[PDB]
Structure formats: C-alpha cells, structure tokens
Amino acid sequence: EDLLPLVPEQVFVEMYEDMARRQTIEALVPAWDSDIIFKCLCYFHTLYPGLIPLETFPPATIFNFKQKIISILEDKKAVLRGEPIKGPLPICCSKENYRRHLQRTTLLPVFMWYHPTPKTLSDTMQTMKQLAIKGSVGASHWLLVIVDIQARRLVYFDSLYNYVMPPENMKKELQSFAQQLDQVYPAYDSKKFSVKIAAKEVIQRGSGSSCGAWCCQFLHWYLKDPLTDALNDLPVDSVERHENLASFVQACEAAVQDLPELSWPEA
Ligand SMILES: *SCCNC(=O)CCNC(=O)[C@H](O)C(C)(C)COP(=O)(O)OP(=O)(O)OC[C@H]1O[C@@H](n2cnc3c(N)ncnc32)[C@H](O)[C@@H]1OP(=O)(O)O
C-alpha cells in the first residue's frame, strides 16, 4: 500500500490568502449605490461646470441608455435654440435650472446599472428593487458611459472589462450609436463621434463591490484629463489599487458631507 496524503483539519486553508485579500478589499471600498453616486456628481459639477449631474434614480440600463442619451441631446439642442424640451425631467431640479444645466453642459455622465439575468428595462428595475431590499449586490454591476459632447467622444468604462459583452461587441454597438448621434447632434465641421473602450483589462480585481467607486474615480480622472492614461498607470497589486481608491472615496464622502441632499447645484 501507499501512504495516504495528509488532509488538514482546516476546511478552508487553501483559500485563506485569496479570502483574506478579498475581505481586505471589500472593507476598503464598499458598494456605492445610486444616491451617493448622485451626490458625488453634484459635487463634481461644482468643480467642473461642464458636467451635468444626471440623476441615477432610476439609472439607465443596457436596454435604454441610448434612448436616454438621445432625449438629453435633443433637449440640449432645443434649449440652445429657445425651444421646448420633450425629454423626461429630473425630480431634484427645477425645470428652469435643468434648462440652464442643458445649456451649459459639455459632458454627460451616464451610469448604467446592469444584471446578467433581466432581459427588459422593467425586469432590470425589479431586480434592482429585490437586491436593495435584501441588502445584496449579487451579480449586479455599475457601468459608465461618458458622452463628451465637446470632443464628440463616447467613453465606455467597465471595471470588470467584459462583464456585459466582449469589448469588440460593445465597440460595434457604440459605433453604430455614434453615427446615429452624428445625425441627432450634428457637428458644424462634420467631425464624427468616436468611441473609446476604456479598460483593456479587469480593473477591480479582487472586489465584488467597488464598481460604483471605480466609475466615479475614472470619471474624475477623465475630468482632470480627457486623454487620461490613468488605467495604465495603476499599481499591479489589487489591494494597493483599492487602498488608493479608498483614499478617493474618503475624500469624496467628506466633500459631500455638508452639501445639500436631493437637489441640483445651480448651473
Ligand atoms: S460593484 C459590483 C460589481 N459586481 C461584480 O463584481 C459581480 C461579481 N460576481 C458575484 O459577485 C457573484 O455573482 C456572486 C458572489 C456569486 C454573487 O452571488 P449571486 O450570483 O447569487 O448574486 P445574484 O445577483 O444572482 O442574487 C443574489 C441574491 O439576490 C437575490 N435575487 C434577487 N433577485 C434576483 C434576480 N432577479 N436574479 C438573481 N438573484 C436574485 C437572490 O435570491 C440572492 O439571495 P441571497 O439570499 O443573497 O442568496
């Protein structure tokens, strides 16, 4: 016979290292939901007046984000010509202040909430409600589509790289959308909307909860520099990545602490 291998009396020991790293990471950067994201955007507007703090309640989804962007751009086009707006209105903003934001904006920060299971807008909202009630993130995810109007650039940011679909499939969908926007919101010089898929690799490695904060951090990097290469200059170590992100979150949460709730800043 052969000597049986030793089986340790510790069920989970083989995973300790990975479990420990994840626990540390989840603790450093917990989930950012719709409400704190909105506050952060309001705050970002005070720093960068070009950013319109679009409401995240309810957020866009993969089923309606294009229609949502088109409604907004059509309304901005209308405001600039003294025409009436036709799109759905914000709940925390007066109609007049909203028109002022539309006139002034050069950048739409479009957060999209996503879950693999729902197959309609309505079912996505239902899934969102169930998860909120049980206090669970689950397989849900935040994505950011930046509509840079001034540069005519659509920037898609997935901190999980390919959670919704392969990057080339999203590139295709967004490239078709970009040519639609060329007709909807035409440029004088005929410059075409271009598309950027921001992440070449998984950004939030080791976390199931840091997506919201990652979206906001990338947005802030983009606001600092619309050609930011920050994603390429990240620490290789995932814990270190989230340590820096934790510093961002802390700074943001401090900055909005005494800012007014449920109301847009003046344009
Ligand atoms: S910032 C967020 C970034 N997102 C990610 O990183 C995604 C990473 N993937 C995961 O975290 C995994 O999906 C794991 C760890 C397995 C999460 O577990 P689940 O796959 O079970 O998560 P679910 O979304 O499937 O749901 C979990 C709980 O929520 C309930 N639930 C409600 N509603 C739905 C719908 N419409 N589809 C699935 N589940 C759903 C479930 O009953 C479940 O309840 P629990 O009591 O928490 O098990």
Which of these, 32, 44, 42, lies nearest to 214 by C-alpha position? 32
- Using a 6 Å cutoff on CB, does residue 124 contact ligand 1? no
Q: Which residues are catalytic?
A: 141, 158, 211
Which of these, 181, 165, 174, lies nearest to 195 by C-alpha position? 174
- Measured in degrees and rounded to the nearest 5, phi and psi for residue 142 equal -100, 135
Ligand 1 atom 35: residue of nearest CA: 127
Report the length, in residues, of the chain: 267
Three-state helix/strand/coil letters over the chain: CCCCCCCCCCCCHHHHHHHHHHHHHHHHCCCCCHHHHHHHHHHHHHHCCCECCCCCCCCECCCCHHHHHHHHHHHHHHHCCCCCCCCCCCCCCCHHHHHHHHHHCCEEEEEEEECCCCCCHHHHHHHHHHHHHCCCCCCCEEEEEEEECCCCEEEEECCCCCCCCCHHHHHHHHHHHHHHHHHHCCCCCCCCCEEEECCCCCCCCCCCCCHHHHHHHHHHHHHHCCCCCHHHHCCCCHHHHHHHHHHHHHHHHHHHCCCCCCCCCCC
- Using a 6 Å cutoff on CB, does residue 208 contact ligand 1? yes
Q: Are 144 and 215 in contact (CB under 8 A)?
A: yes
CA atoms of 48 and 150, how far apart (whole Å): 14
> Helices 211-224 and 238-256 meet at what angle, rounded to 10?
80
Instruction: Show the tokens assigned to 232.
Output: 């390429």
Q: Which amino acid is at 219?
A: L
Q: Are 152 and 191 in contact (CB under 8 A)?
A: yes
Which residues, including other chains, have CB under 8 Å from residue 13's CB and lie 6 or more apart? none
Ligand 1 atom 27: residue of nearest CA: 138
Ligand 1 atom 19: residue of nearest CA: 138
Residue of 136, 141, 203, 210 with the most ligand 1 atoms within 8 Å of its CB, for mutation: 136
Please state the atom number of ligand 1 nearest to the C-alpha of residue 204: 6
Which of these, 166, 1, 154, lies nearest to 69 by C-alpha position? 154
Q: Which amino acid is at 24?
A: T
Q: Residue 143 forms beta bridges with which residues?
A: 112
Q: Which method was it determined by?
A: X-ray
Instruction: Show the tokens assigned to 243.
Output: 């340590």
Ligand 1 centroid–CA 17 distance in Å is 23
Q: Residue 107 forms beta bridges with which residues?
A: 51, 148
Which residues form the domain of 69? 1-267
Ligand 1 centroid–CA 117 distance in Å is 10
Q: How many domains does the chain have?
A: 1
Which residues, including other chains, have CB under 8 Å from residue 222's CB and lie 6 or more apart? 146, 148, 155, 228
